């Protein structure tokens, strides 16, 4: 039923505070039918690197795919600066149970 | 600000669905001041094992801690399809905690 997509980013240890806020940009994700929620998290107590996750909740995986194929997605997405992002991966999940007070 | 706790379960392949069923019973979590949401997920496209995550969203970490030390938690599962004594095929149960820097709900 409900679907969750995760964009897991590994950053240079300590670079989260200065890098993270950029991921708070929705960039029109809420204009996609089926989009429900978005969370941007920073993992506590990591030592090797800083870990940032962008979680998006959808009514279905089709909704998510439509987002990927949308124009708002296409539109979205100092020189020489070494990037703070070490890895960028995507994971997909079926939400088997959800409850909101 | 907002806080997310995660219980990450590695499971015998094929047991994801049954395991999520054991979590339909929130065991009074919503009675805790600060509790906001719960998500129980199954990781897609895994090969040799299953993965289920129990994510709980809170107003603060203190709220989450209050749940763990609450009477409802300390006093709170078996499925109808279980044989007496059957165990959830858990390979590992790990805990992770997160600060939620941003949240948006349509």
Instruction: Report the residue of chain A nearest B103, measured CA to CA.
Output: A39
As a dihedral over the C-alpha atoms of residue B82, residue B17, residue B28, residue A43, rounded to 10 degrees, the angle is: 130
Question: Of the candidates A36, A91, A94, which has its C-beta nearest B105's C-beta?
Answer: A36
Using the Cβ of B85 and the Cβ atoms of chain A, whether some distance falls under 8 Å is answered with no
How, if at all, do strands B90-105 and A35-43 pair?
A: antiparallel
Least Cα distance to B5 among B67, B49, B75, B54 occurs for: B54
Distance (Å, whole) CA B70 – CA B76: 10
CB atoms within 10 A of CB B18: 18
Please give the helix or strand (H or E) that residue B42 lies within, else none: strand B35-43
The residue in chain B having the minimum alpha-carbon distance to the alpha carbon of residue A100 is B37
Start-to-end C-alpha separation, chain A: 20
Contact A37/B4, CB-based, under 8 Å?
no
Residue B8 labelled as part of a binding site: no
Resolution of the solved structure (Å): 1.5
Strand partners, B24: none
- A17 close contact with B: CB closer than 8 A: no
Distance between first and last Cα of chain B: 20
Coil vs helix vs strand at A61: helix
Q: Which residues of A touch B103 (CB under 8 A)?
A: 37-40
The closest CB to that of B101, out of A42, A45, A95, belongs to A42
Residues A6 and B53: their CA atoms lie apart, in Å, by: 13
Is residue B106 within 8 Å of residue A36, measured between CB atoms?
yes
Q: A40 and chain B: CB distance < 8 Å anywhere?
A: yes
Q: Which domains does chain A carry?
A: 1-101 (3.30.70.100)
Rounded-to-integer distance, Cα A11 and Cα A20, Å: 9
Chain A CB contacts of B16 below 8 Å: 96
Using an 8 Å Cβ cutoff, are B19 and B78 in contact?
no
Cα B78 from chain centre: 16
Gap between the Cα atoms of B100 and A11, Å rounded: 16
User: Under a CB-based contact definition with an 8 Å cutoff, are residues B75 and B27 in contact?
Assistant: no
Alpha-helical regions (H) of chain B: 16-21, 61-68, 71-74
Residues of chain A found within 8 Å of residue B35, distances taken between Cβ atoms = 101
Rounded CA-CA distance A55/B100 in Å is 11
Query: Contact, A34 vs A58, CB < 8 A?
Result: yes
The answer to the question of whether A28 is labelled as a binding residue is yes
Burial (CB count within 10 angstroms: exposed 0-12, middle 13-18, buried 19+), residue B56: buried
Residue A38, classed as helix, strand or coil, is strand
């Amino acid at each position: 039923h409900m679907f969750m997509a995760e964009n897991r980013l590994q950053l240079q240890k300590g670079s989260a505070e200065e890098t993270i806020e950029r991921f708070y940009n929705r960039q029109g994700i809420e204009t996609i039918e089926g989009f429900q929620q978005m969370f941007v998290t920073k993992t506590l107590n990591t030592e090797d690197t800083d870990e940032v996750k962008i979680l998006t909740i959808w009514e279905s995986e089709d909704s998510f795919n439509n987002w990927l194929n949308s124009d708002v997605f296409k539109e979205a997405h100092d020189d020489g600066q070494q990037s703070p992002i070490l890895s960028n991966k995507v994971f997909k999940y079926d939400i088997g149970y959800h409850y909101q007070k």
